[PDB]
Amino acid sequence: QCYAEITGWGKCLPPATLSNHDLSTFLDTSDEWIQSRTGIEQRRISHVNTSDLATVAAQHAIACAGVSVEEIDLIIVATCSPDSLIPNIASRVQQNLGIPSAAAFDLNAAATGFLYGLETATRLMQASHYRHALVIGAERLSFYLDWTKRDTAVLFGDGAGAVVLSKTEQKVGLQDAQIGCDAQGRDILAVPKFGTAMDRFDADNGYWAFDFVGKEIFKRAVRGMGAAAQQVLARSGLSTEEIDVVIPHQANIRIIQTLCDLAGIAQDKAFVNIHRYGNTSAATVPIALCEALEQGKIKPHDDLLVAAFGAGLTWGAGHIRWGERITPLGKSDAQLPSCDHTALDLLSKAIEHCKRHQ
Amino acid sequence: QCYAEITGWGKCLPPATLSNHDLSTFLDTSDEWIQSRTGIEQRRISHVNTSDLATVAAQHAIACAGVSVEEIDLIIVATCSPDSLIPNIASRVQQNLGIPSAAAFDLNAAATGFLYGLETATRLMQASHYRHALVIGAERLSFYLDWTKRDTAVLFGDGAGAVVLSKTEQKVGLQDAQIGCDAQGRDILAVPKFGTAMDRFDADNGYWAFDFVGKEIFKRAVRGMGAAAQQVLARSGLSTEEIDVVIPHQANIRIIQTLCDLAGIAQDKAFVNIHRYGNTSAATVPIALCEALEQGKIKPHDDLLVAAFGAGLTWGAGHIRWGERITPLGKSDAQLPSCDHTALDLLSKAIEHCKRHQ
Ligand SMILES: CCCCCCCC(=O)SCCNC(=O)CCNC(=O)[C@H](O)C(C)(C)COP(=O)(O)OP(=O)(O)OC[C@H]1O[C@@H](n2cnc3c(N)ncnc32)[C@H](O)[C@@H]1OP(=O)(O)O
Ligand SMILES: CCCCCCCC(=O)SCCNC(=O)CCNC(=O)[C@H](O)C(C)(C)COP(=O)(O)OP(=O)(O)OC[C@H]1O[C@@H](n2cnc3c(N)ncnc32)[C@H](O)[C@@H]1OP(=O)(O)O
Numbered sequence: 022q023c024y025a026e027i028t029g030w031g032k033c034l035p036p037a038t039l040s041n042h043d044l045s046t047f048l049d050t051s052d053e054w055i056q057s058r059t060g061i062e063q064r065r066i067s068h069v070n071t072s073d074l075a076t077v078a079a080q081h082a083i084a085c086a087g088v089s090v091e092e093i094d095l096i097i098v099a100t101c102s103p104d105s106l107i108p109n110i111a112s113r114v115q116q117n118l119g120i121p122s123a124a125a126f127d128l129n130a131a132a133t134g135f136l137y138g139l140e141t142a143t144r145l146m147q148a149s150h151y152r153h154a155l156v157i158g159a160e161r162l163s164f165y166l167d168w169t170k171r172d173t174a175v176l177f178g179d180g181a182g183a184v185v186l187s188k189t190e191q192k193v194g195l196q197d198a199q200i201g202c203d204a205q206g207r208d209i210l211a212v213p214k215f216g217t218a219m220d221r222f223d224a225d226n227g228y229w230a231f232d233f234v235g236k237e238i239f240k241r242a243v244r245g246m247g248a249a250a251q252q253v254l255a256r257s258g259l260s261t262e263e264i265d266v267v268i269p270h271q272a273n274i275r276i277i278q279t280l281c282d283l284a285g286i287a288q289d290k291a292f293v294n295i296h297r298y299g300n301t302s303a304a305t306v307p308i309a310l311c312e313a314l315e316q317g318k319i320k321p322h323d324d325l326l327v328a329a330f331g332a333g334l335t336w337g338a339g340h341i342r343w344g345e346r347i348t349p350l351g352k353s354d355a356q357l358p359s360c361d362h363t364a365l366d367l368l369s370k371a372i373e374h375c376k377r378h379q
Numbered sequence: 380q381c382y383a384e385i386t387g388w389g390k391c392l393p394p395a396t397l398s399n400h401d402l403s404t405f406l407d408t409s410d411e412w413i414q415s416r417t418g419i420e421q422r423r424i425s426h427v428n429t430s431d432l433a434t435v436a437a438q439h440a441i442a443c444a445g446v447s448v449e450e451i452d453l454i455i456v457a458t459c460s461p462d463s464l465i466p467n468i469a470s471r472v473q474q475n476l477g478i479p480s481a482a483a484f485d486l487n488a489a490a491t492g493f494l495y496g497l498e499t500a501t502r503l504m505q506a507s508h509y510r511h512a513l514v515i516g517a518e519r520l521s522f523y524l525d526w527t528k529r530d531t532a533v534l535f536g537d538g539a540g541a542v543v544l545s546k547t548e549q550k551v552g553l554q555d556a557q558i559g560c561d562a563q564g565r566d567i568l569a570v571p572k573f574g575t576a577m578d579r580f581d582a583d584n585g586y587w588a589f590d591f592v593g594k595e596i597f598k599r600a601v602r603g604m605g606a607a608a609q610q611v612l613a614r615s616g617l618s619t620e621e622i623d624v625v626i627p628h629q630a631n632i633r634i635i636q637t638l639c640d641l642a643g644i645a646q647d648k649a650f651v652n653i654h655r656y657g658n659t660s661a662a663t664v665p666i667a668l669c670e671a672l673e674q675g676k677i678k679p680h681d682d683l684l685v686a687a688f689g690a691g692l693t694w695g696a697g698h699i700r701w702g703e704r705i706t707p708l709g710k711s712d713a714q715l716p717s718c719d720h721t722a723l724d725l726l727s728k729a730i731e732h733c734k735r736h737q
């Protein structure tokens with residue numbers, strides 16, 4: 022029996038910050054509403070493409086793991102905002118870092134995609150000949166947003182997180198996972214007209230609907246994640262008190278609290294950074310894991326519960342058993358190109374077109 | 380030790396057919412050039428979205444396997460032309476067929492994506508609790524094409540293929556596989572400006588370049604596939620004479636012939652249907668497998684070699700050991716909505732815009 026230890030962790034958050042106050046400047050909303058309903062105070066807006074955020078997060082995770090590029094056998098980028106469809110952006114990350122040979126693909130399961138990626142890489146490694154893997158959740162969700170619609174415009178941000186996995190005999194990394202999808206929730210969270218369903222030559226094709234039914238999402242998410250978390254704990258013989266840390270998707274602070282409350286997990290076990298970054302979809306979990314490690318929230322040998330959901334409606338949970346090391350082997354000087362523009366400056370063209378079309 | 384038997388197979392080719400003669404009607408090309416250089420005589424153009432082609436192929440594979448929707452635990456759609464990015468289209472296929480619960484994701488590794496999907500589902504099933512899986516290669520490549528540029532406009536078509544996998548103790552299905560990516564070939568085959576790298580509000584954003592360096596692709600593809608096929612055969616203890624059938628990606632007939640020639644595999648072992656459908660990217664392999672089965676090309680207990688490449692430049696090979704059954708359990712009456720339009724009629728809006736912009 023082999024296992025896939027999380028030997029490296031890393032993040033990349035773009036510098037330009039869109040505050041709740043900044044959103045109040047061009048929308049009928051407030052810090053008071055956004056903060057009390059969602060827990061979000063700020064989020065980051067990328068001046069660079071999704072693959073660039075991915076690459077930097079990967080660079081940090083690679084130094085953290087001390088793994089050479091020659092040893093990386095698999096690259097998975099979990100994203101729903103890739104630079105290109107042809108080719109995939111896993112191959113761009115591969116190109117940027119000079120990784121020869123590795124299998125490289127993009128995985129789309131919306132915000133659950135990192136957990137899907139961790140599950141997928143772990144089983145690939147357990148069943149076949151992949152020595153080390155790079156799994157990245159990376160998003161530039163700001164691409165998609167409708168800057169007239171306050172319901173969604175205030176919820177999402179940009180960023181990336183990465184892990185490196187290393188094959189081992191030790192019983193560490195992802196243990197049981199349960200991933201799934203509630204396809205009856207497919208239409209409640211959707212941008213149906215970006216992709217090959219859109220009219221390529223219509224000049225109004227940029228003004229797509231972001232469909233979003235918050236109450237219905239909340240309900241299906243809590244059920245999806247909750248039942249997945251229960252299957253993981255039940256199958257693994259864990260009592261709930263044995264869970265040391267929860268690393269949840271950062272969609273809404275109330276969803277995190279409800280998940281923990283219904284499962285009987287203490288609220289202070291959940292790592293929350295949604296106030297800083299908002300919902301970064303596939304990046305939420307690996308960024309939260311990275312920061313949990315950075316801030317001393319995870320001890321050697323801890324049991325972690327990861328839980329996530331997203332458009333689909335995809336869902337999942339998993340149990341990670343941490344090994345010996347919670348400290349990086351090395352640091353990276355990798356950074357995004359500098360940018361002195363505000364988040365408002367970056368969104369100007371997009372905001373002005375959306376408001377003019379209305 | 381478990382294995383993932385291919386218990387179901389199925390295809391969906393849209394009816395509207397673009398002949399080489401039809402391409403001669405609006406481009407400086409000929410049947411004589413296209414047929415002798417590529418082997419392509421016809422290809423299909425979809426009147427429906429990628430998810431619809433996927434669904435029908437899935438329906439045929441499900442009846443072929445005799446598996447209920449309740450038993451399907453995993454859905455992978457390999458595609459680079461999804462209807463939507465949010466949500467994924469694996470979840471649409473899931474919705475269409477009423478499959479509850481299953482993990483559902485889109486996998487993007489261009490034409491190698493089906494092989495990536497087969498590898499991924501097989502290892503998921505071997506290492507964890509997935510009883511049956513649905514793996515689909517589905518594409519509407521006609522969305523992307525530059526109807527002024529003859530180099531690429533004549534090469535690609537639309538379609539989908541599916542398999543159903545069933546967990547078993549018997550040593551059948553995918554055995555060894557070797558998948559990878561040659562990221563130094565990333566820029567030779569690319570549509571860099573469809574995705575989040577495109578300017579959403581530019582009215583000319585629909586007139587994207589399809590970058591394509593045929594000679595360089597040919598060379599990297601032959602090397603990529605060839606070395607992957609060698610690693611598969613070497614690791615598995617197979618002599619080349621023991622390979623009964625080759626199911627190759629249908630990009631170019633000369634690439635198939637060169638692959639077989641350099642490996643010392645007899646040319647008549649390769650199944651070729653590129654003359655009918657062209658390059659359908661991720662759909663090529665599962666459609667060719669489905670048709671090989673339909674036409675009596677595969678016997679019980681045969682050894683198959685699958686080989687593929689695509690944008691990335693992704694590559695791979697695998698060895699499938701066939702089990703007992705080469706005949707479907709049941710048939711499906713599932714079909715696409717009727718369409719009496721020609722391929723030319725369907726492409727009219729796209730062709731007229733491309734030619735007017737030039
Ligand atoms: C671009 C990337 C997209 C792809 C994403 C992929 C990743 C994912 O899928 S993760 C998906 C994220 N999921 C979530 O955020 C969870 C969904 N749930 C929620 O957000 C919550 O239900 C939430 C906060 C909206 C509920 O708020 P609620 O309790 O209804 O507040 P309440 O006091 O009742 O007021 C509601 C009203 O406020 C108003 N309102 C909405 N937005 C705002 C705003 N920004 N400012 C002021 N008022 C607002 C509306 O009129 C709303 O009415 P209704 O609820 O009928 O639409
Ligand atoms: C939407 C799709 C997105 C992609 C999704 C992912 C799928 C994949 O990644 S699979 C990729 C598929 N790969 C391929 O098709 C590669 C196959 N190989 C080739 O294309 C060959 O090299 C091929 C067909 C060009 C043959 O070359 P070859 O016979 O050696 O050269 P030759 O006989 O001199 O002809 C080439 C010349 O013909 C001309 N020519 C090109 N197209 C045409 C045409 N349609 N009609 C007439 N002449 C043409 C060109 O001037 C070309 O010049 P150059 O020498 O500069 O390339």
Ligand code: NA
Pocket residue numbers: 263264265322323324
């Ligand atoms: Na514990």
Ligand code: NA
Pocket residue numbers: 621622623680681682
């Ligand atoms: Na044989």
